């Protein structure tokens, strides 16, 4: 009975007041659901709860079957559209993981497993960052910064997305135009444009306008423009229910759309924000991660997340990665 995606969104915004935010819920939630796989006691429960698991309607396994389905429904780089999701386990040379954990990871999550010498911190980082970089076509370069020495295993998740718009924007239709960060801080940005039929929507409650711009394939970009002075209001009103409401509320309309060509990114240490969603234990020495290993002790040192997006007249490019680091002491 909680909106993890939007609860996390607000947490990240509150922590960075008037700065850009960007992340991949699927990446983080899938990572969390994987983590719960080798979690026990209350720690295994804060995660499921934090995800908004029904414990009845949805039963743990349904959660995994879902992500499993998602991973399976993935298609090869079609034409002008590509979405890939992967999971990887990097295990120290001298540690054993429980058969169940490893098995579930390979079966439900199609996870790769790479032996890693964590005694050589520099080498471990290179191996892992190179993999994440490789999987995100060079969009996420340095996921880990100072890999602890007690690092004995790192669980990684990545997401890559590239797609051309269903209908591009006329490259020559872009002009330098004013952008108001605040009514007083204004900066020039290349403003894209295109008059056409779009799925419009006017939410008078949250107080904002929503446009749906489809991609060549299955993925639509939703751009929310909160009315003057209401960004905070709509941010608070964001919810899974709202998104559903917005989705069928959508009716096509003749629109002369002006969108700025942009690029943003976010880096977050999730171990710092998740306890705001009730996910705290697993990140402490009080953690119960007995499902992952028997030489217990281990906890989650940090959970780094990184996401980037590029938006131009051709389409969009987006990727992100989540690195769950398990240490010994």
């Amino acid at each position: 009975r909680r909106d993890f995606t939007f609860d996390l969104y607000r947490a990240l915004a509150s922590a960075a007041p008037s700065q850009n935010i960007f992340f991949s819920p699927v990446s983080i939630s899938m990572s969390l659901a994987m983590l719960s796989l080798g979690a026990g006691s209350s720690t295994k429960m804060q995660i499921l709860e934090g995800l908004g698991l029904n414990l009845q309607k949805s039963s743990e396994k349904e959660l995994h079957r879902g992500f499993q389905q998602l991973l399976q429904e993935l298609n090869q780089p079609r034409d002008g559209f590509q979405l890939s999701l992967g999971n990887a386990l990097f295990t120290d040379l001298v540690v054993d993981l429980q058969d169940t954990f490893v098995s579930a990871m390979k079966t439900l999550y199609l996870a790769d497993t790479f032996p890693t010498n964590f005694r050589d911190s520099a080498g471990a980082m290179k191996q892992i960052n190179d993999y994440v970089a490789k999987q995100t076509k060079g969009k996420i370069v340095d996921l880990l910064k100072n890999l602890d020495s007690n690092a004995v295993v790192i669980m990684v998740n990545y997401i890559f997305f590239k797609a051309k718009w269903e209908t591009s924007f006329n490259h020559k239709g872009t002009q330098e135009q004013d952008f108001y960060v605040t009514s007083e801080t204004v900066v020039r940005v290349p403003m894209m444009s295109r008059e056409d039929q779009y799925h419009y929507l006017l939410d008078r409650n949250l107080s904002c306008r929503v446009v749906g711009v489809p991609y060549q394939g299955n993925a639509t970009a939703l751009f929310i423009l909160p009315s003057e002075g209401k960004m905070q209001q709509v941010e608070n009103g964001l919810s899974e229910k709202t998104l559903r409401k917005w989705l069928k509320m959508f009716k096509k309309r003749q629109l002369e759309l002006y969108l700025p060509k942009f690029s943003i990114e976010g880096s977050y240490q999730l171990e710092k924000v998740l306890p705001s969603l009730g996910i705290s234990n697993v990140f402490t020495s009080h953690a119960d991660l007995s499902g992952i290993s028997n030489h217990s002790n281990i906890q989650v040192s940090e959970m780094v997340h990184k996401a980037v997006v590029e938006v131009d007249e051709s389409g969009t490019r987006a990727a992100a990665a989540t690195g769950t680091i398990f240490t010994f002491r």
Binding site: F22, F161, V181, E235, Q254, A307, V311
Partner: peptide
Amino acid sequence: NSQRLVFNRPFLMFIVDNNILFLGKVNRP
């Protein structure tokens, strides 16, 4: 008619599949 819609102030962004793939706020291009 032809309604005008210009994103010249902070704005949210969703990249939706059947699930929410990406979410963020563009506070400043």
